[PDB]
Design a protein around this nucleic acid. Sequence first.
RNA 1: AUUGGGCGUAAAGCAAGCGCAGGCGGAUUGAAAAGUCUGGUGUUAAAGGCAGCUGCUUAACAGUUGUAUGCAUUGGAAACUAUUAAUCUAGAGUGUGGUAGGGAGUUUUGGAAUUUCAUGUGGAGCGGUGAAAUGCGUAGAUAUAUGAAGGAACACCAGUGGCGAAGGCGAAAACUUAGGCCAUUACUGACGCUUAGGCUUGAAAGUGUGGGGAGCAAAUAGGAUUAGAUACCCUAGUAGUCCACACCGUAAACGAUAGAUACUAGCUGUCGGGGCGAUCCCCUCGGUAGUGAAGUUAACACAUUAAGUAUCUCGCCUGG
RNA 2: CUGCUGAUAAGGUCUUCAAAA
Lengths: 85, 141, 135
Amino acid sequence: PVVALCNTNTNPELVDFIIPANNHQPQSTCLLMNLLADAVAEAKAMPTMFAYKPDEEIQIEIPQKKQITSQRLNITRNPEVLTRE
Amino acid sequence: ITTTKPIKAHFDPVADLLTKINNARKAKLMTVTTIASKLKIAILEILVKEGYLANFQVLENKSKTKRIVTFNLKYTQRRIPSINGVKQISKPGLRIYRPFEKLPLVLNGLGIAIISTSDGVMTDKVARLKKIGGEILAYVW
Amino acid sequence: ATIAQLIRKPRKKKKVKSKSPALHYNLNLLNKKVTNVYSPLKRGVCTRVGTMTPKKPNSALRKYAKVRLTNGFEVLTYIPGEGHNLQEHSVTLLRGGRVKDLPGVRYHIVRGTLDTVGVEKRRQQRSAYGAKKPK
RNA sequence: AUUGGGCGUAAAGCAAGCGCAGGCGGAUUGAAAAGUCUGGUGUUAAAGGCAGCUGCUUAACAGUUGUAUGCAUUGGAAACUAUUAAUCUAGAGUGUGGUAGGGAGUUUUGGAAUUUCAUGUGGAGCGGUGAAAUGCGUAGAUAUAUGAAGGAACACCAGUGGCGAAGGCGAAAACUUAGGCCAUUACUGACGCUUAGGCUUGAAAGUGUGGGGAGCAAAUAGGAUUAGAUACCCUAGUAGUCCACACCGUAAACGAUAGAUACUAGCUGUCGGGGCGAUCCCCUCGGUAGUGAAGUUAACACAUUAAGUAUCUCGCCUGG
RNA sequence: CUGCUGAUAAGGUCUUCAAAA
Ligand SMILES: [Mg+2]
Ligand SMILES: [Mg+2]
Ligand SMILES: [Mg+2]
Ligand SMILES: [Mg+2]
Ligand SMILES: [Mg+2]
Ligand SMILES: [Mg+2]
Ligand SMILES: [Mg+2]
Ligand SMILES: [Mg+2]
Ligand SMILES: [Mg+2]
Ligand SMILES: [Mg+2]
Ligand SMILES: [Mg+2]
Ligand SMILES: [Mg+2]
Ligand SMILES: [Mg+2]
Ligand SMILES: [Mg+2]
Ligand SMILES: [Mg+2]
Ligand SMILES: [Mg+2]
Ligand SMILES: [Mg+2]
Ligand SMILES: [Mg+2]
Ligand SMILES: [Mg+2]
Ligand SMILES: [Mg+2]
Ligand SMILES: [Mg+2]
């Protein structure tokens, strides 16, 4: 079994437990990864981190380095493969 | 029911439907539409009776001058169809006529053979029961 | 192709040619006509004896004979044996065959059936070469 | 290869088009029943084949019983094909309205550049090559400036482009003229697809008659290189290349892929019509390209402009 | 930075084997 955070560009056949999600946002990936880790940690019995928690404990920050930009750019680095004679 | 795209059909009524069904099966498409003819309506009725399709539904224009039939394939939960293949026998030009003695058995009885003898289209088993045969349209298994 | 196309011009089957054509021609000698009657083995008369060289790989001197049959065809025939009594003018009895080394040769001579003597000094596979049983 | 094969690169899609006969062909109603299915009857000689049995010591063999196929006639079935009598618009055309084009023919016009000739300045070379030599030049060449004549081809625009069925089409204009795309509450009402035979067009070379000839250049002559050079290089050079009228009818005439029709993921450009109204960009309908999954393939690759799922028609292939 | 630069007699080995340890 393999679970994954599919992000609109993945082949659904390969993944068994598909989780439609984001993969580019460092907040979304963190939230979902920590949710899976929370499942694991609850099963192996420690206190949870994000699951079954209110807003004051689910809240998170946006890493450094208006709104956040989940836009895929840099198409100019996709030239035609070297050809011609 | 309202549509948006133009609807066209081939001149050959059996193989038009067979091509539509085969392409839908291969592409996992569920609902398809085509022009309605009475041979096609009867053949779709027997396919629905034999359980190879979910539903077939005929519709008529507001002026009662055009009729179109739309049908859906029967996919299971894991999305694999009940139809495995289609092959047409009585193509235009070479029409296949077989008496009762030579009525074919498709895939050792797993599939069905469409035969339009004298009472409209008719499955192979019921044709054998009635002891009479005729034109053989297509093999569906 | 197409049912109509084959109805108009049906399938023509490729012809079949024999491997020993000269054995299936019969000359009447009264009306002087040649008819196609199949015959297993035919009598001929030799004209020139000698040796030929095998094609590419083999290297030897193989005994051939230009024999004219009871019909009007002259064929090059390989004498299958070690030593021969052919004297440029004799009657032999050709059968079908094909030696691979010599190009153009497509017949063999049955040994020890007619004027041509058999192959003595042979105890193995002699029934093919016409040798009396040692007893 | 009807059952039972193929034609991009292995043999095989005619160079392309207009197409008579033939083959195939939208939807609904009625009749008849030519195809199709089925019942009765007559017949399909005997021997032979298959099944059963008997007799030869069993067998081979002999004998005996059963055992199909097709044709004709008569009686029914009416789903499909064909025929006939009609209705309908969705295929295909026509009309009106938008509209893009190097589509074609005929007749005129224009400017750069080469060559020749004329007239001035000038004075030893120019040309050509790997290096040179034939060749041109003190009769003033090459160069420079002006002018005239004539012929052929039309820089830039010019394209990750447009048009035609193919060959093919690019300076400007006029006249005549062919097809195509988009939207149609309009009209005819299956009039359509393919096409053996037939007809039309068909790069360049080549032919015949008459014109034209600036440049280039098969054949030809000379100088080089070379063991030789009838070739590659150079200097000259006729036919030809150009126009009109008649033929020839072949090309790697290639997308190495016949035409028509329906269906099957997506993404990126570009060209035209239409919807909105600065451009740009958005949507719809089509043309032309790239990338790309299912699917196909021996592999390369094709992949909504198919080589995929299928049908129809024509042409073609059967080892070297 | 384009000189020149042509030819090489005939036939041939070489995989025995996995049954198996
Ligand atoms: Mg083959
Ligand atoms: Mg070929
Ligand atoms: Mg072609
Ligand atoms: Mg060809
Ligand atoms: Mg046409
Ligand atoms: Mg016709
Ligand atoms: Mg019909
Ligand atoms: Mg009989
Ligand atoms: Mg008997
Ligand atoms: Mg001048
Ligand atoms: Mg010419
Ligand atoms: Mg000379
Ligand atoms: Mg050389
Ligand atoms: Mg010259
Ligand atoms: Mg001449
Ligand atoms: Mg040719
Ligand atoms: Mg061309
Ligand atoms: Mg590709
Ligand atoms: Mg041959
Ligand atoms: Mg040298
Ligand atoms: Mg030599």
